[PDB]
Amino acid sequence: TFGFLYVAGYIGYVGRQYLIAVKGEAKPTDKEIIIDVPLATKLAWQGAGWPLAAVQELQRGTLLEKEENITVSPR
Amino acid sequence: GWVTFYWHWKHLTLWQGNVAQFDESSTYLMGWLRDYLWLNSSQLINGYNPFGMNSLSVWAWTFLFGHLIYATGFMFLISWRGYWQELIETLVWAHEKTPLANLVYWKDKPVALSIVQARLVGLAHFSVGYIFTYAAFLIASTSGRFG
């Protein structure tokens, strides 16, 4: 069980870091169909410590976005 | 369907005194296909055949009746209105141009079923065929075994 959750979170955490990193570029969508391999490779190696990094974001209040910035439909 | 398949097969093997067949075949899906459906259809599909018929012929007939209604429903679910409305227009043209038949005429202009109506009718055929097919299989496979 814990073997899977470590690898699964590794994949998820690395992908999330890449997504956030490229959203500061001039054309974010171009970095999603043409992968920035040098950037992707660096993030892959640093994902071995995701359980520590994820907790710090959770404790720092930066893991989640605020409700005022999330679009929703009328209710 | 999953719930009742489960209930039925577990009781068929209990009623036959061999729970091991369920315990060993239910862990993979070929087991359900081979040992539940295929194996227990034998008496049902022989209700009538070239050599005669027996009291399971009604269930054999209903079994195929269920498959037919089920499949007819696929027509309404897959093909949608615009195709049929165009088709009916050629039939409207043909009727008015046919001698001895254009003397008769409709009071309601024929049209294809509506978009919503097709979904309901198609679901109705799907559902009725679903129910009848299983009912025939359930009764025939149980009573034939224990009747």
Binding site: - | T4, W7, L138
Partner: protein, 73 residues
């Protein structure tokens, strides 16, 4: 025994679909947001995305792994 269990479970299945159907009809025809301001019913609409997305996660997990285990066997 087989006919009775199958008969009532299918009827239960249809009845449950109707219950949710008329729950959806209620929200359109009868629900009044002003007269339910801030109560539990109006708050269900406030986190409908959370409810739907978690139902989606549960269904995905069960589907992937139940089908996966059957196929593995």
């Amino acid at each position: 025994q087989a006919a009775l269990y199958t008969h009532h479970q299918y009827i239960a299945g249809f009845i449950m679909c109707g219950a949710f159907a008329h729950g959806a009809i209620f929200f359109i025809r009868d629900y009044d947001p002003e007269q339910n301001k801030g109560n539990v019913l109006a708050r269900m609409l406030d986190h409908k995305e959370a409810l739907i997305s978690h139902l989606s996660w549960v269904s995905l997990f069960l589907g992937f792994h139940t089908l996966g285990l059957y196929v593995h066997n």
